[PDB]
Amino acid sequence: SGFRKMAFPSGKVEGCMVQVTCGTTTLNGLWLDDVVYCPRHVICTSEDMLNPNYEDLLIRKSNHNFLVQAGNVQLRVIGHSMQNCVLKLKVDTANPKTPKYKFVRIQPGQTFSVLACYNGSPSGVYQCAMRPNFTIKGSFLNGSCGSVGFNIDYDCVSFCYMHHMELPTGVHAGTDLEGNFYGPFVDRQTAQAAGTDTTITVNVLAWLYAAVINGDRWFLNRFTTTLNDFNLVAMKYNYEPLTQDHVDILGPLSAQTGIAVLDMCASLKELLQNGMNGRTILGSALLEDEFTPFDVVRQCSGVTFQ
């Protein structure tokens, strides 16, 4: 029993974190096999942050301009290349701690663990979700660029996010490990705004299913809804549209609890209308949207109980 925002154990990623220095700028890099991945903005200078020409900046660099430190060891850079917005520094040592891994680009609503790091050393681990507007709501201070987000579902680390910048509203923007930004953002200092954010409806429903699995039914009701009527209501509360894909995705949790997906939709509709009336759901007074259906199945018992 219980339900917590749970990250993956971070050790497999800790063993890959390095420090990359270029000029006066230091940030984090990710060392896998003989490659160190980091944000290409490490090569920018102070008077050229708004419209850097990365090709022109990089061609001027030699391998020895990049200082890469792994623990107390300096690694030797033997090559470099740029892929989209990431820099790939080839080094003369394979990381002996490289885990089984892959690179996966995720979709809005997906969750992942973030290993916040400064100067190549890990600070803490927490869970994030890719918001519908392609930002994340992280905890990142100056020096955290190059920190990564990942999942580790079956002993293989799937890297999905590398941290690049903070938008004026205090939310965070970055890339996959191929260097393609999530959302319509660019690695330039010119002020950018994220789309209005919305609530991840499918995740709220999953978390209501978690609450039932853990023994709480107070918020259910005798009603149901069509999918279209649910969406017409939920959008008035800034909730994301629920698709038939989402309905299908919720099938297993519906089967476990005996609560049809559209019935749980009717419960959500009522909660949006009524609030909680001084009650909580899984210890929250707000509707939680950063647990996916997959997260709930991984964390909760397979036996609806209590």
Next chain:
Amino acid sequence: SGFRKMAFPSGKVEGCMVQVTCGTTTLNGLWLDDVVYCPRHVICTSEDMLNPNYEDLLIRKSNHNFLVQAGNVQLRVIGHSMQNCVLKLKVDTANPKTPKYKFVRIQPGQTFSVLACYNGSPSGVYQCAMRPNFTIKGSFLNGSCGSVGFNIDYDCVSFCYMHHMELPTGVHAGTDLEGNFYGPFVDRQTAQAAGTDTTITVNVLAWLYAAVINGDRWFLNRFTTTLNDFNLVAMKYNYEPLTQDHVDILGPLSAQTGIAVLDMCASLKELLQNGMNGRTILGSALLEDEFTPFDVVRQCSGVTFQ
């Protein structure tokens, strides 16, 4: 920017987790030096649990009855003994991954990171506080016993919790690493219950300071109060008493933000007496009490653990 519930990086602890099997029961152990620590209840059948005599149950066992796996590698048990409610299995090999560590017993209100494990394999990490009622609001399924809680104090892992049981309300109980239970609990199937819990006042205040540091200031007001006056309110709202030591601990945050502790207590008084009036603080509609003053300072400064 940003403030998130964050766990310590777990890698140093992941290298210490093993699987311990006795009879039909498998749970987790902590392998440090040449000793594996696990709950003494591992030696019990389901009839034994009604009224266990642990010393008598242990003499019937010998070393070969304890099957210990570190990953895919068997560990040979060469001795066995009990300290309070933990079994200490001497093995023939010191763990080469043993970190710098100490065993510490924590106080209610202190937070720690839990590395949830099953079959000796780390599955998730999350942040807990030892509640005033000496339970923790964990997330644990069958097979999680022996999972550990810890802090990292500079360069040293401070182990503070080993998981033993779930209480009827779905909260959790366990021991320090010397096998002394937190709270008035026993490792025997008898009627047990969590006591009425209270809110950790000093931690709420710490979190309000974190909110202000992150630009969330709507709850500030012109008023101040006195300790005796505030403690009357805390008592009324099932908050722990605030002591002068708590005030002193929060001194740094008072100086940084310009809001004296009793000034923030005036804010907390007003929130307890009037609610949040539809607003949130750091994205929460509840007053969060599982961040210590140290957690706030740490996250707000980027402290690191290589």
